[PDB]
C-alpha cells in the first residue's frame, strides 16, 4: 500500500500485545518507529523470516496462469536452458509452472515440478560441465569455477540460466539439490569475503595467507606484487600502485591479504556471480533476500532437511577425554534434542559447514582431508563460547558446569555464525 517496500534487511513483526515492531537483521535491533528503543529483544527466527518473505512475494496477475514446459529426460539441462532463457518476460515464470515430461513417462518425486527441479539440480551442479567445481574442503559442496570461461564459451548465459532456475525454486517453494560454499551465499548477499572464507575456495591460498597473517612476512620477503599463472604467459601484477618495491610488513599485512583475496578469488568469479545474480533477481529483488544470512539463505534455497539426531549421535566420535556417557556429552545431545529442527540444521552448518547430510547418514560424513566423522572435543575454559572447525567437522565444546549454561552457550554460538 502507500507505505511501500521496507528498506533492505528490515522486517515487520507482530507482538503478542498487538503492536507491530520492526527488526533490522543487519544490526540485529528492534524498534517501534517505522523505518520509512528497546522494543522486543532481537530473535533471529527463520520460520518468521520465511513467513514474511513468502507473504511479500506477490505474483503478477497480467501473466498467463500456467507456464507449460515439455522436456526430454535424457538431456533435461539443454531443453530447460532453451525454454527458460527463451522467455523475454521473466514475470511469466512467476506463474504456476507445470512441466509436462515427454509422454508423461513419470518418475515423479511427489510432484512433476519437484522432479524437474531435482533432475535439473543434478545436471547443472555436475562439475563435468565446467560451470561449477567441487569445493576444497568437501566433495559435495560446489563453487563457481574461475576457469569456467575456458571450458564453456557462453558460461555467463548458463550462469544466468542457473540463477533463473534457482530464483524459480525459491519463488515457487520448490527446492534445489545443490549446496554451495559459504562465500557463494555471501556474494549473493553482497557481503565482504574474508580470509576464513577462502578455506573453501582453495587450500593453498588460504594456508599461505593464514601463515602471512599470523607470522611476520619479513622472512618471506614479500612484495605487493603477485604472479598470475593463469592466462597465456606468466606475468606479475601490482596490487597497489608501485606494488613492486613495496614490501609486505606487519603494517601492510591485512591490506595485502584483502587485495590478494580480491584479485585471486573475487575478481575471478565476479563476472559469473553477477550473471548468476542477474538471472536470480529477475524473479526476486535482492532486497527481499537480504534479510537472510548466508546460512539461512542456504536453508531457504536448498530447504530444511530434517536431521535424525539418533543417527547423528551414533556415528560420532568424541575427542580429548569426552565419552558418550560423559555428563557434558549427553547434556549436549539433550540440548540438541530439545532444540528446533532449524536450530539443529544451524548447528550442523556451524560445525559441519553445510546443511547437507550424506544420503547414507552420518557414517559417510566427509571433511577436508577425507572421510571424517562428527567430533566433539574438549577445549577452552567453561565461560568461552563453543567454536567450530568445518574442515574437520569439529566442535570445541568447553566443559560446562550445568545443563542450562551449556544450552545457553551452545544456542548463542549457533545463532551467532
Amino acid at each position, epitope marked *: 500500500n502507500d507505505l511501500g517496500p521496507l528498506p533492505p534487511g528490515w522486517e515487520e513483526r507482530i507482538h503478542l500485545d498487538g503492536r507491530t515492531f520492526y527488526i533490522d537483521h543487519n544490526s540485529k535491533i528492534t524498534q517501534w518507529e517505522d523505518p520509512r528503543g528497546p522494543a522486543v529483544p532481537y530473535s533471529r527466527e527463520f520460520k518468521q523470516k520465511y513467513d514474511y518473505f513468502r507473504k511479500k512475494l506477490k505474483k503478477p496477475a497480467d501473466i498467463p496462469n500456467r507456464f507449460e514446459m515439455k522436456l526430454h529426460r535424457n538431456n533435461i539441462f539443454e531443453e530447460s536452458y532453451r525454454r527458460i532463457m527463451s522467455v523475454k518476460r521473466p514475470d511469466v515464470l512467476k506463474a504456476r509452472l507445470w512441466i509436462e515430461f515427454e509422454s508423461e513417462k513419470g518418475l515423479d518425486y511427489g510432484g512433476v515440478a519437484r522432479e524437474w527441479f531435482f533432475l535439473l539440480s543434478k545436471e547443472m551442479f555436475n562439475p563435468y560441465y565446467g560451470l561449477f567445481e567441487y569445493s576444497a574442503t568437501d566433495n559435495y559442496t560446489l563453487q563457481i569455477n574461475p576457469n569456467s570461461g575456458l571450458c564453456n564459451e557462453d558460461h555467463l548465459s548458463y550462469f544466468t540460466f542457473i540463477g533463473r532456475v534457482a530464483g524459480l525454486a525459491v519463488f515457487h517453494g520448490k527446492l534445489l539439490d545443490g549446496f554451495f560454499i559459504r562465500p557463494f551465499y555471501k556474494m549473493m548477499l553482497g557481503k565482504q569475503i574474508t580470509l576464513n572464507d577462502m578455506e573453501s575456495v582453495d587450500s593453498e591460498y588460504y594456508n599461505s595467507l593464514k601463515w602471512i597473517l599470523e607470522n611476520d612476512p619479513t622472512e618471506l620477503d614479500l612484495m605487493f606484487c603477485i604472479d598470475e599463472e*593463469n592466462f*597465456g604467459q606468466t*606475468y606479475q601484477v601490482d596490487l*597497489k*600502485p*608501485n606494488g613492486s618495491e*613495496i614490501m609486505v610488513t606487519n603494517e601492510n599485512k591485512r*591490506e595485502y591479504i*584483502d587485495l590478494v583475496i*580480491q584479485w585471486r578469488f573475487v575478481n575471478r568469479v565476479q563476472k559469473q556471480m553477477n550473471a548468476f545474480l542477474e538471472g536470480f533477481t529477475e524473479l526476486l529483488p535482492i532486497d527481499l533476500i537480504k534479510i537472510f544470512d548466508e546460512n539461512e539463505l542456504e536453508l531457504l534455497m536448498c530447504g530444511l532437511g530434517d536431521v535424525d539426531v539418533n543417527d547423528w549421535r551414533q556415528h560420532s566420535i568424541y575427542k580429548n577425554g569426552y565419552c558418550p556417557n560423559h555428563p557434558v556429552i549427553q547434556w549436549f545431545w539433550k540440548a540438541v534434542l530439545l532444540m528446533d529442527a532449524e536450530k539443529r540444521i544451524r548447528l550442523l552448518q556451524f560445525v559441519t559447514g553445510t546443511s547437507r547430510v550424506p544420503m547414507n547418514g552420518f557414517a559417510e560424513l566427509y571433511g577436508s582431508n577425507g572421510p571424517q566423522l562428527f567430533t566433539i572435543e574438549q577445549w577452552g575454559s567453561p565461560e568461552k563460547l563453543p567454536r567450530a572447525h568445518t574442515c574437520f567437522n569439529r566442535l570445541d565444546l568447553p566443559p560446562y558446569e550445568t545443563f542450562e549454561d551449556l544450552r545457553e552457550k551452545l544456542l548463542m554460538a549457533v545463532e551467532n555464525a
Partner: nanobody
Amino acid sequence: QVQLQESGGGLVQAGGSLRLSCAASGNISDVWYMGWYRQAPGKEREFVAGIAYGTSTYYADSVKGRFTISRDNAKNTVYLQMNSLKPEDTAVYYCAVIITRFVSYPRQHTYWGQGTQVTVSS
C-alpha cells in the same frame, strides 16, 4: 587513457588542515586502487593512503589517525584530508590509480599524478 591532476596542496602551519583533490579525466572504467603517495625530500615514494576496492580504506602507520581518504564517484575524485599536519608531512603528494583493463589477460595500468608540494610551518 586516464590523467590525474592533484590540487588543494599549499604550505600550512603544523597542526593545520590540508585537503588534496585528485581530479581524474578519461575512461575510469573500474579503479582497482585509488591511492595517495608521498615523496619526501631525498626519499623514495611511500604509501600514504589507499581506497582499493569498495569502501575498505588503508592508511600508512605514520599517517594513521591524522589523515582521511574519500572518493567522490560523480567526480571520481579522491580527497586526502591531513590534520595535525607535521614536518614529516612536508613531502610532495602524488595521487595514483590502478585501472584493471581486460584485453586477453586482465592487467593493471598505473596512472600517476603530477604532485603538490604540501609543507608544515612550526
